[PDB]
Design a protein around this ligand. Sequence first.
Ligand SMILES: [Mg+2]
Lengths: 244, 298, 213, 813, 222
Amino acid sequence: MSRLEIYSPEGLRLDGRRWNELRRFESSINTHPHAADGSSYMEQGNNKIITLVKGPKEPRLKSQMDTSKALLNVSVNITKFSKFERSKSSHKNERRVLEIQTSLVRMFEKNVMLNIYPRTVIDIEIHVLEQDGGIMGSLINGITLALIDAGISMFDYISGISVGLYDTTPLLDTNSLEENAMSTVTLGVVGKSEKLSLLLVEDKIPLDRLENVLAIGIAGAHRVRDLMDEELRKHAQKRVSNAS
Amino acid sequence: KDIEISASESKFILEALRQNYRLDGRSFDQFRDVEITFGKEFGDVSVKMGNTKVHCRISCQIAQPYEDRPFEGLFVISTEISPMAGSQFENGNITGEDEVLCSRIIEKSVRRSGALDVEGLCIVAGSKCWAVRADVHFLDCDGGFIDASCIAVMAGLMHFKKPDITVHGEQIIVHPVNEREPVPLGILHIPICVTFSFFNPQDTEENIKGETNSEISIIDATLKEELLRDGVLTVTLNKNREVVQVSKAGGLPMDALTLMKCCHEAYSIIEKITDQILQLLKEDSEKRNKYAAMLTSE
Amino acid sequence: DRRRLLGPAAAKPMAFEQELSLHTGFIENCNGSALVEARSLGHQTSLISAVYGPRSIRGSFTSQGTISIQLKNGLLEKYNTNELKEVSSFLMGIFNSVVNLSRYPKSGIDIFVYLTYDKDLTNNPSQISSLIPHCITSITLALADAGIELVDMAGAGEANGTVVSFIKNGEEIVGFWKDDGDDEDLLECLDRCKEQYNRYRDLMISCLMNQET
Amino acid sequence: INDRNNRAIRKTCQWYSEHLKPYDINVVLVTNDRLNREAATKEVESNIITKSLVQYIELLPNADDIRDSIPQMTFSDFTFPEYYSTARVMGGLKNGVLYQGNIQISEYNFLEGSVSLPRFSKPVLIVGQKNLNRAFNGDQVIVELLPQSEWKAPSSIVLDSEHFDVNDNPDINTTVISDKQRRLLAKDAMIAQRSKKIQPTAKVVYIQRRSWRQYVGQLAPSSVDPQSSSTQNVFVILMDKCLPKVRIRTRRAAELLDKRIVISIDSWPTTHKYPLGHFVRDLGTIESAQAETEALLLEHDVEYRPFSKKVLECLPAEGHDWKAPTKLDDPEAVSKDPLLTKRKDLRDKLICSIDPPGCVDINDALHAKKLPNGNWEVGVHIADVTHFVKPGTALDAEGAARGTSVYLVDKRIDMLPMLLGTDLCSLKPYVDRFAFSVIWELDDSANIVNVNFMKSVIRSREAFSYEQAQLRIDDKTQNDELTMGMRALLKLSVKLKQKRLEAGALNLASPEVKVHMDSETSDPNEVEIKKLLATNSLVEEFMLLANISVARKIYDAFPQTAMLRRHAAPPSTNFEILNEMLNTRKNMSISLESSKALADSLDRCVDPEDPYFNTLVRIMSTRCMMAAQYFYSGAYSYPDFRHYGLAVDIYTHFTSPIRRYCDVVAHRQLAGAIGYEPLSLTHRDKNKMDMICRNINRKHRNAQFAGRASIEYYVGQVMRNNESTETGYVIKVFNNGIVVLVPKFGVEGLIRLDNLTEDPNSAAFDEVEYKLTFVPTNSDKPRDVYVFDKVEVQVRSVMDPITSKRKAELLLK
Amino acid sequence: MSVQAEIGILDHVDGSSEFVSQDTKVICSVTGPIEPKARQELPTQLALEIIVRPAKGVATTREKVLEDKLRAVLTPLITRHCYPRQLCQITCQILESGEDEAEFSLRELSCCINAAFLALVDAGIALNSMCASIPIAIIKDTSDIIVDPTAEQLKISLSVHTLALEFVNGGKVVKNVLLLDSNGDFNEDQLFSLLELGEQKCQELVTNIRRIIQDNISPRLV
RNA sequence: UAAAUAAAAAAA
Ligand SMILES: [Mg+2]
């Protein structure tokens, strides 16, 4: 048996990080060419996410076909071995998961015009291999990368972030322990703007905190967005070098 | 089944919103008055917002707690839609986009938020626990289902009383309402849900860069206004000066400033609603006994 | 459960010479049916096979027929649902060679096999393998009774957990099921099951002649 | 992992040493572990200055002044024994091996308990965590006697959960102890080692039944992180002194931190030092006046909800408009109620009620006359509650369950709906009321010639407070027939009280304090004392007379099931402690030979210098006395019907039906006895009677407890609020505290040793001389305090260094 | 037989009603004729989608029986051949049981029949005739036949009955007995004495029902 | 709905 705190007077957290550090970010494009039109493998901390974009293609049922826009579908597979303690049941039908899937759809319905691929279907399959806090933000980044890899038109990037709050000051990018310890805010940010695609608060949060917490998240998300551009451009430079 | 709306209606209502006008003759920050009616039994509450009619029923029964939580009771919220609220709804459709959202908003507002003291639902640890159930019935629809439901669940829970219990280990005699009075369920806070609908002006001319058309945002939209909105926002606030939960999935992209303004506007509404809800709980509590003072011990 | 009546969920369940009988065409609900009862020693098995088809599938462009087999637990809940699906997949791998599929284009044949009972006696100081040849016997009878064209009579046998199905008078094999048991029983099991096949075959042919007469 | 961590600490010292070399600052590793000291002594890798704790202290310049504080002198941590096997239990039971007793925990040491056993004259002691084996006060327990090598005298130290093993924290190994506790433990052990008068000690091997109800407590701030919203394992201190603290896990640790909460025990396994429980509800803040009262009624298991609607129908259709019939022979009345024919008309009599100033529920009234034959006619009238409260009704059922009215300081809890208690059954003045009346015919020497009982209608001439009656008797201006009868009552009262005391009647005393309002009805002004007037003897003597006559009558009519009340003689062991000290200190003693010798020696326990001493001893004698107990006549034989305290052969409670349930039964039995109505078969069934007595003895006790704890609560607030100074007498001396009893409020408190001195470690305790010697705070001189010493006392807010709590403790002026 | 009903209370439905007998309160809604699902389609007649929601908890097999019996009453009432290949959704939300639902479903069924009929009337759907339903029970000692029994009367009953008749000619001619659901055991003399007294109180109810229908609806018409 | 040597008496 043990006990632990949140934020020490020395400005140190349970894992050793300070109040404003992003975890290790690794990004990966075109990971499954023979399985999808677009694919991305995300590593944000201990989080490991495979994202597959299949489409635009013919619908399997003509009943479900829109002549004005493409049909966008997202299925999140949170594996039974994503956490330390293996879950006995499947999480697929869980109301918490249905809300997550619904949330993500609502977010990107306004971010892709989805008016230039009529009579087609875009299927997005996601596999969460490992989970360690901020899984929603990582899900957002995985879809954005995979969609771009598929050459599917969109207006801008959508970057996802996780916020942790203790006392006066929130902690950027929370892990499971911190998530357990304190309420968190998940932010969907469009491009380099201040506009949120997704605002998600599931636990109690003082009303004074949010304005400042939002400010920290937006600044951090911009850094994340910059990294993503670097991640793809860098890969392109590396790929070109490999070709040479 | 897809509802049919005339192109003429879509142009009329949109243009009216640019002229700060709406069909039901309301304001943009105005919320339709909420009427709360209590039935004979405790936990029976009827919420009415204009034409919108919802009914909630609170019930409980002796059950055994989960292995993971031996000190906590059980609490579930049901919001199954039916064709009674309109033929647009499929019977038992509990996986549709709007249905799952609404189900998740209520859950994050009441269940997850810990509005109900589930620890006080335990009779004997790891053995017997009360199982409170909130059943929401969507009688008819004129929009604002999420707002109606949150009011309905909370008013019901605060209304509700559970038979008094004497516990001696594993044996408990549940006193009937005849034998002794029932006990009210514990509440930690009173969450209120506000729904915001966003729109686009579609107008050629804007008078100034400094002052602009910006974005259309109304509160508690009707059925006709709900079909034409380009964005959905639901913020839950209480009288404790804190945000219970807020859910924005996609829709029309908005600034962090705009969300705050909606959040601050909603706070003035949830204050009036909470006090009003308490008042109708006070009026119904004193209502029940014609002779209660004659009745009293203390 | 809002579909059936499962009762109280806080409760718990209870905690504690080859002979054949063949009958076909006793169900008027389907196109073909069969009853198979076998008693050996202290162990006996009674199962019912129901065949529905061939019925046309709307929009189907298949140039041949489509067979679907499902095993069910009639009374005793013993075999896992996962294992029932496995045998079903094994059974369909057999009759897709047996059934003349070229005869039923744009059509489908559904086969329901109800394992109403099996009785097992075990002494104290696989399992479903023994039922497999009886399932094959039942289906082949139910298909032949229904009017479905079969290239040959399908039959099988069980020897030390090794099941192998034969057609064309044991000259060829339409299915092979080996679980556990012992090694080097390849030649032996092939000879022992071939005898069970020929025995099951003649009784199956006689069955149709009897009822048909 | 232990060696890695020690290597980690050693690496830190190594790093700091190298890091601080340019500044000429060395590092000293203070460790008692032999692994680090050996690893540094060998000096394998780097040079690290390692010193043990004691070895480091001896390097300070002031070694002497800080040395004394320092202590001088496959492994499994101690554990409680497993509960005895059922087979072992039934084998022991049959062989004569085991007995079971109700454990009463001592009131100042939660780790000492006793169990009464027939075999043994004094209570058999059960001492310590282990031998107590997770019992709670109240539990039915099976015990085994320990060998005489293990027998102990009553402990000389006080203790609670808040102040024992204060280091430990609950969770859902290695153990260590504090220096005072260590030294305190040494002193206690020494006291045990040398004491004469050790007593039978046992140990708990099983529990027959458990007294775990819902309880009330407040969290240990010391176990809670007040600024963290996480779920927390924490310690709850219960409101009862005896109970061990409880470990509960709660999401709201920080929120509940100044709340008076309710919890329930779930288990107490061998391998946990404390019971585990769980949060039930929050009654509100610890200062809240209201919540303390609700808390009080829960702790006592007293119902106070509005009377069940079901009860109301039993109440009369016409409520406050109910009226005694004008003509008893009225025909409509006689149809609506046929028993009326048997009711007597006593209205012409001059009935008056003498009740306390805020008394609205008036039980009884009295009348007098001079008969032509020279003798006097004295009669007693009591509320006819059983006319309205019928057996088998919901109203009888709620009253029977409640068993008694409960009087708190600010509240009265009724047994019956107040339509009865304060209107229709109350013997209100100037209004015809039904009543049960017993009338005597006695001579001038107050000797009873005959006595009669009947159901009657009476009209109250006047309702007095006690004082008015005394003034009307005294003045000598009013010589009307009524006043002449009142004086006749007092004259006969003196005769009856004389004979009674000569017969061996006790004269105990406990005149508790009273509270008064300002012009506002809820704004309190003063604390005073109620004075016993001669009229008070006047009401009590006739209540006693009514109750004795009634008991004889109903036992006569129903020898098997009469509702009676007995009071056992105290064993000498009850007076063992009290008697010995007085004999030693003054060579003055109180005699246990009879109740008359007890009463007379008590009377003679006088200090000429101080009047109060006699009252001190009288209140202390009251504590010793065995509980009086309701019983049905069939349960015992006649000599055991004895009321010791009252020195009468047979007694019952009749005079207060509205506020007690025993009376209701006695009333029905008397109406049965006189042929007025048949007795309900309920009160003729021994099993039902036996269950009724069990319940009402329980309700009676609980009501006394609740009564006292309301007074203690208000008085405790009041003295502090006043800043007032009040005297106290020492009735107990331990090694680490004394107990004082206060005359004005008559409420005991514990002054703890470290609230009596800034230095405890220099104190002298003498167990033979009943003496504590210490150096007071705000003073420099050694002080001797003894038992029976007049002291002065007051209340102030102390914050405990060990317990982060700041309660309002009782101190010595 | 002091029932109370309201008509046209819901906005987003073709027809609705709220029937109340004693405690038992049921609200009903009817949409139709509308486009049916393929599995619902009937080539020549109207398809009925009948849903019953309980006052507490979710719909179980119990309500599935309430739906089935309610179907037996409403089916012959509606002139279904007027709406081929079409659908009519009928939803009943029981708001208050008015009885121990763990033991009885008598009053809820009768109230659902009356409410459904009223909702069909409000919706303007072709009906062949009129209809009324009442709950009946028999006492344990007295063996009296009580029409419209209370919850307390049901507890001490030996048999419970649901009777729904089909009326024509201004509510004077019993065209047929749409539903009789008797649970319990019976004597012939009691049955016809029940039917004789029951017919009288039913006829009084129709007269009252006609009054209510005219009073509310006439102000709407010209 | 079990069960004690668990504060005498009077009025509240
Ligand atoms: Mg009195």
